[PDB]
Amino acid sequence: EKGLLIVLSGPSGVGKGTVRKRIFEDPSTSYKYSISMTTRQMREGEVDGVDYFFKTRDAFEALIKDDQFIEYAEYVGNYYGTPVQYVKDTMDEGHDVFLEIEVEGAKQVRKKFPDALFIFLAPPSKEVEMMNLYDYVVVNDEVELAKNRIQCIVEAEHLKRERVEAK
Amino acid sequence: KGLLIVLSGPSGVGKGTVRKRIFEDPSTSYKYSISMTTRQMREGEVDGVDYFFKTRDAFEALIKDDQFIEYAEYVGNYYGTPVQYVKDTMDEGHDVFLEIEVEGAKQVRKKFPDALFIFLAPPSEVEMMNLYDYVVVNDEVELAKNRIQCIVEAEHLKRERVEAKYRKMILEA
Ligand SMILES: Nc1nc2c(ncn2[C@@H]2O[C@H](COP(=O)(O)O)[C@@H](O)[C@H]2O)c(=O)[nH]1
Ligand SMILES: [K+]
């Protein structure tokens, strides 16, 4: 059966990168990561096809026109986006794909992947009002706790009657 | 309000054993709905712990008075979920847990369409799974318990529930 698409976001600085890293460190599960494309200049120590696929702005816009992104956004004059083909093929192989996107991107993703798992990482306890775009809300109080919560969510998704029924 | 959690599934699948294990875990926060039954009490069972044991007369008078969320006949005996405990306990904010056979679960679904329905499946039925939200295989008791636990945790993390909390809190201030 198809792998899940798992989409993690949250406000900038909430710690989504740190939580994602811990999740991918967990040997109980096996996730695949999408390498994003960007049009920003490559920095010291970075490798094309590892940190990012680095593209010209014209190439990125050609790819947008040909509908080759699940989602994209422009930040300070540079585009960033998730290529569609890798994610599609990888899910078709039966692997769960675990994406990190910026908050407003959920709407774009959900149009193409309505049954994806959308997880909003929230800071500990108003602009956080963008959670309405998401399926689940997980508080990043501590990295280990946030990871465990996300792992219950993904585990539960695998137990969903729809999946098991079709199976 | 707390969640209504419904564990059901085919006869002999091990609903009782898994429920038992769930409530032996000190980290389990749910409150168990003690059912009424008209079957005879068995060695080791305690009235008001395992079940509220009732006569058929009393059970039927309670049916007539609409005092059950659900009830069913199973191998010649009545079993049912008293309404007041579930309503009061959910109102207090506690999750309430039902362990019931499949006909009773259908009645619960009609009255509580947003309840959490978990179907306990044998390690080996497809038609039976239709109304349910989740399917958990009873391959082993500890494994089944843990799966149910992460399903309930995930339901507490649903955005609709979390958002409603945050909104009430912002409006309150
Ligand atoms: N519908 C319904 N089934 C119940 C209730 N309580 C127990 N059962 C089910 O009745 C069956 C017989 O239980 P036992 O007689 O073995 O304790 C089990 O499958 C159990 O899940 C109840 O309150 N309602
Ligand atoms: K019961």
Side-chain angles (χ1 to χ4, degrees), chain B residues 15 35 39 42 51 70 72 74 79-81 99-101 104:
Chain B
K15 293 179 284 296
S35 285
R39 76 152 172 78
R42 293 162 186 172
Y51 285 99
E70 62 76 31
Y74 183 84
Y79 298 79
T81 295
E99 171 253 308
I100 60 175
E101 56 67 70

Side-chain angles (χ1 to χ4, degrees), chain A residues 144-161:
Chain A
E144 191 67 15
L145 300 176
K147 177 218 50 171
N148 285 348
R149 286 173 198 130
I150 291 162
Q151 296 284 47
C152 289
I153 292 163
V154 177
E155 167 79 11
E157 194 68 21
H158 282 289
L159 300 166
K160 203 62 196 50
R161 185 262 308 154

Side-chain angles (χ1 to χ4, degrees), chain A residues 112-159:
Chain A
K112 291 180 172 170
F113 297 87
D115 300 306
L117 192 39
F118 292 93
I119 305 175
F120 189 96
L121 200 66
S125 192
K126 181 168 145 52
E127 56 261 62
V128 182
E129 200 196 303
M130 206 92 80
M131 64 178 45
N132 57 18
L133 305 183
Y134 291 78
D135 297 333
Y136 295 89
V137 176
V138 170
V139 176
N140 187 24
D141 43 6
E142 289 162 36
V143 179
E144 191 67 15
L145 300 176
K147 177 218 50 171
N148 285 348
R149 286 173 198 130
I150 291 162
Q151 296 284 47
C152 289
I153 292 163
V154 177
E155 167 79 11
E157 194 68 21
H158 282 289
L159 300 166

Side-chain angles (χ1 to χ4, degrees), chain B residues 88-131:
Chain B
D88 287 354
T89 305
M90 289 172 70
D91 281 346
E92 288 160 358
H94 301 298
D95 300 340
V96 175
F97 193 95
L98 310 188
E99 171 253 308
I100 60 175
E101 56 67 70
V102 290
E103 302 306 323
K106 302 180 180 173
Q107 291 166 53
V108 182
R109 183 105 249 184
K110 271 147 155 258
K111 292 180 183 176
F112 297 88
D114 53 1
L116 173 63
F117 294 86
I118 304 178
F119 184 91
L120 194 67
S124 308
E125 283 173 0
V126 167
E127 161 81 72
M128 209 154 302
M129 292 173 39
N130 206 317
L131 73 82

Side-chain angles (χ1 to χ4, degrees), chain B residues 24-82:
Chain B
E24 287 171 358
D25 189 330
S27 86
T28 292
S29 282
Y30 336 139
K31 299 297 189 172
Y32 180 54
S33 169
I34 301 179
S35 285
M36 289 187 180
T37 185
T38 65
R39 76 152 172 78
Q40 286 195 351
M41 196 176 64
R42 293 162 186 172
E43 199 217 19
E45 292 184 332
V46 170
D47 191 14
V49 172
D50 296 69
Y51 285 99
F52 294 111
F53 295 89
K54 303 294 181 176
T55 61
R56 293 175 325 280
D57 283 341
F59 199 105
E60 289 173 5
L62 290 158
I63 295 167
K64 292 175 183 183
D65 193 38
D66 208 4
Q67 294 300 302
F68 292 110
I69 282 163
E70 62 76 31
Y71 70 92
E73 192 140 26
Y74 183 84
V75 190
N77 296 290
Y78 295 113
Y79 298 79
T81 295

